[PDB]
Amino acid sequence: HVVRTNGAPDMSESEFNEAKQIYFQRCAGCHGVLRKGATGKPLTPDITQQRGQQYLEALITYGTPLGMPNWGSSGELSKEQITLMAKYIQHTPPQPPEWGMPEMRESWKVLVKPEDRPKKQLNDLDLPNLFSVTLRDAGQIALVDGDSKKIVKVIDTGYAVHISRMSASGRYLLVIGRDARIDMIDLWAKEPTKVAEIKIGIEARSVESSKFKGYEDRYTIAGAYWPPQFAIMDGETLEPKQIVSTRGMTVDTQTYHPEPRVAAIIASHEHPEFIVNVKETGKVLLVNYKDIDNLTVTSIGAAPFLHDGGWDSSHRYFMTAANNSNKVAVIDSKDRRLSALVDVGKTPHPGRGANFVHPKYGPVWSTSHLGDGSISLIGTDPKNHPQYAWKKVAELQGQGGGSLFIKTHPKSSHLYVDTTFNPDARISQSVAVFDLKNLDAKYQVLPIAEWADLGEGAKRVVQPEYNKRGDEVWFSVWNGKNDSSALVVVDDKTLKLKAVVKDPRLITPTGKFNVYNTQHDVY
Amino acid sequence: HVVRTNGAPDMSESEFNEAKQIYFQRCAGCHGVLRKGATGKPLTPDITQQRGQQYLEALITYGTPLGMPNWGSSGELSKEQITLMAKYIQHTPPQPPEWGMPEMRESWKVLVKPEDRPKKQLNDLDLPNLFSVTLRDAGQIALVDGDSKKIVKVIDTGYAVHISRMSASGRYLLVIGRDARIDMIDLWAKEPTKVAEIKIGIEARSVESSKFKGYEDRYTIAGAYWPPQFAIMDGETLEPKQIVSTRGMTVDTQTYHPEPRVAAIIASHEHPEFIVNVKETGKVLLVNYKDIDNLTVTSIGAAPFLHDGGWDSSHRYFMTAANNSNKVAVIDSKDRRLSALVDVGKTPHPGRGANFVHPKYGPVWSTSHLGDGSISLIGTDPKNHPQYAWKKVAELQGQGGGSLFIKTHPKSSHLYVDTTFNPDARISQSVAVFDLKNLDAKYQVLPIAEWADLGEGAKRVVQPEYNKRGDEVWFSVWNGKNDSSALVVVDDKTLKLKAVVKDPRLITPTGKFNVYNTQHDVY
Ligand code: HEC
Ligand code: HEC
């Protein structure tokens, strides 16, 4: 047969199915399963037909400097395949494929069997103080030694590399990409080495390890945007064990939703459970892995379009926000119930938040507001500060909007606030630091990008991350003009510049994950 | 001879000079005379050699959707010329050319001699209520009828079309592009028609007409980034009459600066003079055109890196800011002196500002702050409010940072504030409106982008512009996803939606210039 779309170059039924398979294996992680866009732009026929075949071939062939791979000049895709892809994205988007146990098992690779792995750490690295750094546009992670401020390893994962997580033993580093590829890295090998890989879906954002006491390295979980599902895997091998669909009913209208994406997963410390946020249906699932054949799930209704979330300081209450809402949902992971919906007056910015002790209000959890740069504080201690629990107690004011990350550490007296997307260049190039011992005082500004010494041009600073001791804070810096990058390290006790990590291998550093602080949910 | 650069494909001395001529005629308006970038990205060899010949050819050939023309697929440039350009931008940037009276006169075209033009308005348009709208990526302006809300004419100018200005008679519309091309349009023709064109430099931003009483249509002035100069032309024909270099000594170090760009030009109402801001040397020039053969210029030292500025409500004091400064310079255009340097505590955002009467402080001029969305008010009435003159008297707070334009009108009780570059989508898609009769009250938010009804996707709203009566406010809206655009019209007395202008010819509408309000400096 012939596939035809108004205004599109007709294709063979075989050409279309070949392009379909390429699209969902290689493109959908960034462009979406219905091509509506995510990290990458929309590729629906209204837009692509306006660009035309030859423009589309050119873009796919050479890529762009802002994260679109050069599929042709890389050799990843053939001239003929690129022509097929340029034709394909001008046709109506088809139904995306499913991805079950057969597809997962076919993608599963064990490079080093558990019995062939070392019995102890064979390298001499200070593993808890390693930083795993995403090299966004290079499809790699870099392992950076926190003590010597040197790159010690670079590891290929794939385009669309996203985040790193740690197993509860501290031995295994887990990386997931937006195409739902997972890599498992053994930090005890003579040089840290990939030991297993698997693909759990077409599009994904989240991975996590089992962190309840006694379950170290037992299970790894991953959540997909498409298909709407999460998968529980063997923590030692990534062998897929259980797959659970998240298709289902919405919390607000109780009508069936055909694509409830998994937004985020964190690991419970109160029970052997994973906390799974399901976005469109607005459900927080507590998934119990004490028995994975007789699988227990508690579904807590929260609010539609759930985003990220994070633990409070006690690791009991899960603080989460939904888009289009001024409320923070508080899930009690111990009693397995919704505890509160906290009005913070403004829309909270998705993220783990930042926990610290307010001298007056006691333990608080904090969230930023993207538009105006304010930060809301919520009391999180029903035991000793019941008069403040699940209430907004205060508001701090940063330099302005555009913050992506706020960060503290239990051993630090400072709160760091970036302003990556602020439209003023001096503010996007700097970070605000609040004194937790005098929260009535204005923040101080650290000139992070200037310290990086990267030449003239637009520089953006992102994501404060502490070292294992809590006495250094690391920042990613990148000059959009010349492709140049650095990690800037501040002494948290003095607020002085301590080090600048520069290396040609440090390509578009974005997320930085300190091993200890990621393993132990320290924020 | 052979031109060679480390890492660049060698070129014929003739090929290089051919590419040089193309670069400075067609590319430098956006990419800069030393290729350091302006509207378009930097094209210095460090960056271009990393991209490589074939990527560079592809980009030049097909362009990009964010304002880089498709030189090859347009037919503007040959395959051979595009190869030469891709080689050329990998070589060391050469010295840019000069552009004097011979070059200006060679570019000068009179399409309709003044004696052949109509003696009165032959079309039936309400000319004072026309809006001249920049169609940024189309190289055109659209004339939109303020009464019927319909496009009535579309006029080609060139890529990099920038702003519109009006002659003091109300008859001639002046358009300048970033390549320093000027078009003069006769609004009295049966259909408004280009009557003259000229090129006054390689790179430019500003054009203005003579507005002192009695000099209607006598002179047009334009200022260039490169060469560092301004040119005075005959107001009826654009014939070049006088060219003045702005090369000279800096205000702060009194050392010679070889490229002092003309930042902005406005027209004096106190004297037959143009006010010319010279950026790097920090000089405000009062250029007197009573006698242009015996040319008098008063040079007022202000501050380095002068930007835009605007008149106060009385059209006597020129309010201007320099980058990297918390001060607003006040130039008295009547007495021809610096009046004050007003500390507003934060960096003012370049712009004309907004004038209104504060019930307590009297006439004030207002400026926004890009980072945090605040607005500073300065008293501008030494006669009746001397206790507030040249002092910051108050601060308003908008939705957040990212404002590009604030706007009022003497017949309006509202102040409008866009937030085009705010990182929160709801804020960038809306505008704040303050009640000038109750400035203690919080602003109201108008959902401008939602009213435009442009489908899902990132939409940005920019530049409130009033109609001639002051009772409508117009906004440009554009959906980045689908290329779709609208002008949204609000009833200023009710703050209700009044009209939505949609037309496939409305491609990337940016600046909107109401004829009457531009002619009479009404802001
Ligand atoms: C994330 C790592 C991506 C993957 C994998 C793919 N694409 Fe992509 N693409 C991505 C981005 C961030 C962008 C925008 C970059 C820009 O500079 O703004 C793009 C762009 C495209 C386009 C152009 C869209 C347009 O001009 O409107 C096309 C045609 C495109 N991408 C296609 C495409 C294909 C077919 C891919 C699989 C082979 C693919 N992309 C992968 C990000 C990412
Ligand atoms: C303004 C109207 C422009 C004119 C005239 C020219 N260019 Fe341009 N260019 C412009 C922009 C806004 C951009 C960036 C667009 C993007 O999508 O972000 C560009 C880009 C380029 C590039 C690519 C740079 C890179 O990938 O780093 C090149 C090689 C380039 N432009 C070359 C070029 C030439 C040779 C031109 C004259 C023939 C030219 N541009 C004109 C804006 C504008």
Numbering used by the authors:
A (entry chain A), B (entry chain A): 21 to 543
Q: What text comes from the article?
A:
Denitrification is the stepwise reduction of nitrogen oxides to dinitrogen and is utilized by many bacteria to replace the terminal oxygen-dependent steps of the respiratory chain under anaerobic conditions. The reduction of nitrite to nitric oxide is a highly regulated step, since both of these molecules are toxic to the cell. In NirS, these domains form homodimers by interaction of the 15th β-strand of each subunit, which is consistent with the SEC data collected during purification (data not shown).
1-bound structures by a rotation of approximately 60° around the pseudo-eightfold axis of the β-propeller. 1-free NirS with other Pa-NirS structures reveals a higher similarity to the structure of NirS reduced in crystallo (Cα r.m.s.d. of 0.37 Å) compared with the oxidized form (Cα r.m.s.d. of 1.09 Å). The difference is mostly caused by the position of residues 55–64 and is consistent with an observation previously discussed for NirSH327A (Cα r.m.s.d. for cytochrome c of 0.35 Å). 1 domain reveals a lower Cα r.m.s.d. with respect to the H327A variant of Pa-NirS (0.75 Å) than to the oxidized or reduced wild-type protein (1.34 and 1.39 Å, respectively). Additionally, His327 and His369, which are both involved in substrate binding and catalysis by NirS, have different positions. The open conformation of NirS may also have additional physiological importance outside the denitrification process. Therefore, the conformational change observed in our study can be envisioned to release the N-terminal arm to allow flagella formation, thereby regulating cell motility. Further investigation will be required to confirm that the conformational changes observed in crystallo can also be found in solution and are associated with distinct functions of NirS in vivo.
